[PDB]
């Protein structure tokens, strides 16, 4: 610590001590159903972009490693979560939005991005936490004579809500002349038709887009991964996994009167204080296990090599471990130095009226005194 080979007489603060965890426990809900992605990715026809299908998937087990075998997509874009860690933590419900778009419009399905399809057809929120999948559909959604199945909206009076669907077709009034259902010179139809040909370039090609949206907890978890649960253990500093909430500490039965809609508990520093167990409805409060400071009390290196250790603030009937002498102090406890009933001047100040010194005993020892 001192980066030196000779240590002068006194008390120094070296590295701290921690109580290491013994085992690990994994906790997950009581649901064994399988999530049905087989009616989402392959289908005869997809919904239009102005009328996009929303599928709620909940109360099942989602294996995200079989998504790559269901559609030929080059990448797997995500915001707020990694693609590789989708099987580790778990959520409340997952939402699927499947629709077809053009080649220009792939980039505008993004948070905080405007354009033509993002502000009139489908708007994503700026705090979107989910994944976007896009893939080519040349041999599935194209015809040589022109595929006119899908439609689009391009004129609107105002902007768009995040996650809003517009179905009604009304003739736009772009001028002072009233329309009244007449598509005249100043009135136009709000929906024209997509035209797809196989002779177009790659920037106008069909693209099927599936958007998976997540919700970060705030509710009892219903969709979770294939991680196997483990039986509970108490009064031991262990590593816990409460519905994807990881951490290390000791768990105890508590007496905090949780309301029935409450699951977590926050401290001033916004850390998790108490958790409701998902399998059995009971409360456990999390405490970090024992730690503290280590102080080294020594005389000079040329004098002797005897060392006393002071554990700062620790009532050391709980220390898992160093001589045969243990002395309690208002600053902690002292190991390696014996207590005497005499009184001298203060040589090495420990604290709370206690000092230590290297003195003869008959034969040489480190003693502590008032």
């Amino acid at each position: 610590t001192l980066k030196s080979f000779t240590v002068e007489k006194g008390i120094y603060q070296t590295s701290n001590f921690r109580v290491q965890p013994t085992e690990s426990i994994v906790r997950f809900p009581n649901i064994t159903n399988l999530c049905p992605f087989h009616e989402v990715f392959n289908a005869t026809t997809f919904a239009s972009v102005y009328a996009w299908n929303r599928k709620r998937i909940s109360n099942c087990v989602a294996d995200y490693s079989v998504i790559y075998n269901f559609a030929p997509f080059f990448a797997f874009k995500c915001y707020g979560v990694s693609p590789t860690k989708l099987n580790d933590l778990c959520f409340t419900n997952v939402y699927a939005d499947s629709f077809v778009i053009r080649g220009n419009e792939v980039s505008q399905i993004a948070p905080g991005q405007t354009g033509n399809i993002a502000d009139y057809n489908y708007k994503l929120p700026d705090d979107f936490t989910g994944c976007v999948i896009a893939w080519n559909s040349n041999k599935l959604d194209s015809k040589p004579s022109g595929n006119y199945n899908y439609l689009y909206r391009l004129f609107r009076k105002s902007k768009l809500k995040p996650f809003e669907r517009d179905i009604s077709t009304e003739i736009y009034q772009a001028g002072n002349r009233p329309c009244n259902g007449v598509a005249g010179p100043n009135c136009y139809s709000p929906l024209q038709s997509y035209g797809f040909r196989p002779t177009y370039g790659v920037g106008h090609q069909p693209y099927r887009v599936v958007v998976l949206s997540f919700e970060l907890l705030h509710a009892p978890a219903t969709v979770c991964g294939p991680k196997k649960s483990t039986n509970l253990v108490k009064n031991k500093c262990v590593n816990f996994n409460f519905n994807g909430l990881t951490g290390t500490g000791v768990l105890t039965e508590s007496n905090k009167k949780f309301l029935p809609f409450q699951q977590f508990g926050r401290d001033i520093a916004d850390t998790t204080d108490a958790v409701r167990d998902p399998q059995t409805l009971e409360i456990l409060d999390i405490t970090p296990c024992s730690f503290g400071g280590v102080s080294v009390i020594t005389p000079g290196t040329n004098t002797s090599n005897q060392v006393a250790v002071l554990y700062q603030g620790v009532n050391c009937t709980e220390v898992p471990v160093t001589g045969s002498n243990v002395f309690q102090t208002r600053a902690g406890c002292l190991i390696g130095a014996e207590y005497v009933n005499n009184s001298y001047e203060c040589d090495i100040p420990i604290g709370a009226g206690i000092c230590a010194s290297y003195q003869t005993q008959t034969s040489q020892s480190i003693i502590a005194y008032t």
């Binding site: 909430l245 204080d273 603030g313």
Partner: protein
């Protein structure tokens, strides 16, 4: 606002004003000496039981060696500040069992054997009007395991690596030093600060002390009872003023309040995101992959390190102010308790 009452001195070049009577008064001056000794663990405050965040913290400089060195230099300086102020006497003096000091009472400032803490009555009043928190290691690192439904900020400060060290001199030894100084200055006067103690009757060293202000010593010996009654009445009025008003000790309460709210702000700074996606390292490690969580952990490390540097700089400035006040208190103890001062309004 009003500057004061309007007055005009009737000055003339053949007129003088001379007093015929006096008044003995006892005033009270409050002085801070030491502040709270604190210790900060960087590794557990910044990251906390995290291998990846610790390895990213090692990629920075030797910032935390500097912070720990500065906090240790403050913590030694507080004990030095107490040692210079209170330990100005070589030998612990004791008062005789007979307490007739020429008619002066001296019962409310000399210690009593009934109390186990060996503090006098006015010291008990001074220790009662300051609601002090974080006196040292009160919890002893096991009181927070006994979870209470009303959680206090002390366990939250403890569980983030922000510890408070106890002072070297306990309050029993401070009371013993104060009792030694009082027993020196009652039975001997200013002689115990130069060499050994020189015994002298109290009504004679009081007549010595009237000679230092230009008053002849017959004034005491013809008015001893009136001066003793005035001193006893002033002592009783000081006792009543300390019993009634609790806002007189405002200088010592701010030393507790500043060092409580600084640690409270340092604890509350852990809940900020600092531009990242979350304020919890476990959720960052669980959600993201390695490369993006490196960026998020870097943002949290930079924010928490800047907060720790701000706290350390504020503690350094406050420790400088406390050291200046402690030097003033040591000079006041050396020049006024151990002698008699001719400096005006000192």
């Amino acid at each position: 606002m009003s500057l004061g009452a309007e007055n005009s001195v009737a000055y003339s070049n053949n007129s003088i004003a001379i007093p015929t009577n006096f008044t003995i008064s006892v005033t009270t001056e409050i002085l801070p000496v030491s502040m709270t000794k604190t210790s900060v663990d960087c590794t557990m405050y910044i990251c906390g039981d995290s291998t990846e965040c610790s390895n990213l913290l090692l990629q920075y400089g030797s910032f935390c060696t500097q912070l720990k060195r500065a906090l240790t230099g403050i913590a030694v300086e507080q004990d030095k500040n107490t040692q210079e102020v209170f330990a100005q006497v070589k030998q612990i003096y004791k008062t005789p069992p007979i307490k007739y000091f020429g008619g002066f009472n001296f019962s409310q400032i000399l210690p009593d054997p009934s109390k186990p803490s060996k503090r006098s009555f006015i010291e008990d009043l001074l220790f009662n009007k300051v609601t002090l928190a974080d006196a040292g290691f009160i919890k002893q690192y096991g009181d927070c395991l006994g979870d209470i439904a009303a959680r206090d900020l002390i366990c939250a400060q403890k569980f983030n690596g922000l510890t408070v060290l106890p002072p070297l001199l306990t309050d029993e030894m401070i009371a013993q030093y104060t009792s030694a100084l009082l027993a020196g200055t009652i039975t001997s006067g200013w002689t115990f600060g130069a060499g050994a103690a020189l015994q002298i009757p109290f009504a004679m060293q009081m007549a010595y002390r009237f000679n230092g202000i230009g008053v002849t010593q017959n004034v005491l010996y013809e008015n001893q009872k009136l001066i003793a009654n005035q001193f006893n009445s002033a002592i009783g009025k000081i006792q009543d003023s300390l019993s009634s008003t609790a806002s007189a000790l405002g200088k010592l309460q701010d030393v507790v309040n500043h060092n409580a709210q600084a640690l409270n702000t340092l604890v509350k700074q852990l809940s900020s995101k600092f531009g990242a996606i979350s304020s919890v390292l476990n959720d960052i490690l669980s959600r993201l992959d390695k490369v993006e969580a490196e960026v998020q952990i870097d943002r949290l490390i930079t924010g928490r390190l800047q907060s720790l540097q701000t706290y350390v700089t504020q503690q350094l400035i406050r420790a400088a102010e406390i050291r200046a006040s402690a030097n003033l208190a040591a000079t006041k103890m050396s020049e006024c308790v151990l002698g008699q001062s001719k400096r005006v309004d000192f």
